[PDB]
């Protein structure tokens, strides 16, 4: 376990404990919808020692990096074409609007929250 | 006792040695034997099984 | 037995139909739906012979109908000027705007009590 992720590992462990303590059982299909691709693991009842995980990640990464590599490179090449880059440019221009004496996407706590004291701190952090 | 920097902290062994280690407790207790559990003994995936 | 707690109601529901007088019907009770499987009761004299033929008879096409159609539908949607149709329909069908309403339960008919309406509305959310 590389030390660069120590606090993050702890956060994940806490989330896992909550999941373990829940009633989300009787699952015929893993409760995932999109994003990440799953993998069936050793499941020694529930256990996966870090060293088991190490191979598990290799065996997850190999069969498909190529696909990702092809798609991204393709998209980047498309981006360099006449009237393609422009589509993106206009999309980017409207998606991210930023003008003189104008704000940026900012936190808008206009619904009930714990306290104005906190709301102000949250806004400053968002900034 | 031959170094003074600390007691051994690892073992590397044949699969058969490991099969025994992996299938017994290490805890100080009455007795115990079973199928390997905590130690990942499959050299296909690892080389490191666990800690005794 | 993972859905056994569900099965408890389903078993009841099935039995309520067995105990119902909806009989002397030549027609199937099938409007729009599922693949039909037919066996006798007869103290379960042969539901298993029928089941195995049905299972393997279904395996033969291998749900290629559904399988091909979904794959086809996706391959269709994946095209230019096709997604637009789908997306426009979805967009018009499901509407979101700034701090507006989304699909919502509207209990504008007689109800047993306002309390229940509140319970239903909370469950809907």
From Swiss-Prot, chain B:
<comment type="similarity">
    <text>Belongs to the Tevenvirinae major capsid protein family.</text>
</comment>
<protein>
    <recommendedName>
        <fullName>Major capsid protein</fullName>
    </recommendedName>
</protein>
<comment type="subunit">
    <text>Homohexamer. Interacts with the portal protein. Interacts with the capsid vertex protein that forms pentamers. Interacts with hoc; one hoc molecule associates with each capsid hexamer. Interacts with soc; this interaction reinforces the capsid structure. A total of 960 subunits of the major capsid protein forms the 160 hexamers.</text>
</comment>
<comment type="function">
    <text>Major capsid protein that self-associates to form hexamers, building most of the capsid in association with pentons made of the capsid vertex protein and one dodecamer of the portal protein. The major capsid protein self-associates to form 160 hexamers, building most of the T=13 laevo capsid. Folding of major capsid protein requires the assistance of two chaperones, the host chaperone groL acting with the phage encoded gp23-specific chaperone, gp31. The capsid also contains two nonessential outer capsid proteins, Hoc and Soc, which decorate the capsid surface.</text>
</comment>
UniProtKB/Swiss-Prot annotation, chain C:
<comment type="function">
    <text>Forms the portal vertex of the capsid. This portal plays critical roles in head assembly, genome packaging, neck/tail attachment, and genome ejection. The portal protein multimerizes as a single ring-shaped homododecamer arranged around a central channel. Binds to the terminase subunits to form the packaging machine. Attaches to the host inner membrane most likely through interaction with host yidC and forms together with chaperone gp40 an initiator complex to form the prohead.</text>
</comment>
<protein>
    <recommendedName>
        <fullName>Portal protein</fullName>
    </recommendedName>
</protein>
<comment type="similarity">
    <text>Belongs to the Tevenvirinae portal protein family.</text>
</comment>
<comment type="subunit">
    <text>Homododecamer. Interacts with the large terminase subunit. Interacts with the major capsid protein. Interacts with the capsid vertex protein.</text>
</comment>
């Amino acid at each position: 376990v590389l030390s660069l992720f120590a606090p993050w590992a702890k956060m994940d462990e806490r989330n896992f404990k909550d999941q373990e303590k829940e009633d989300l059982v009787s699952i015929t299909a893993p409760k995932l919808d999109d994003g990440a691709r799953e993998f069936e693991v050793s499941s020694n009842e529930a256990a996966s020692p870090y060293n088991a995980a190490f191979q598990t990640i290799f065996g997850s990464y190999e069969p498909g990096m190529k696909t990702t590599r092809e798609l991204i490179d393709t998209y980047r090449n498309l981006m360099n074409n006449y009237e393609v880059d422009n589509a993106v440019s206009e999309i980017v221009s409207d998606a991210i609007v930023y003008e003189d004496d104008t704000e940026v996407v900012a936190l808008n706590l206009d619904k009930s929250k714990f306290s104005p004291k906190i709301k102000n701190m949250m806004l400053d952090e968002f900034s | 006792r031959q170094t003074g920097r600390g007691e051994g902290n690892f073992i590397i062994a044949s699969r058969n040695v490991v099969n025994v280690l992996a299938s017994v407790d290490t805890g100080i207790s009455y007795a115990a034997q079973g199928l390997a559990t905590g130690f990942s003994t499959d050299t296909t995936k690892s080389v490191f099984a666990g800690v005794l």
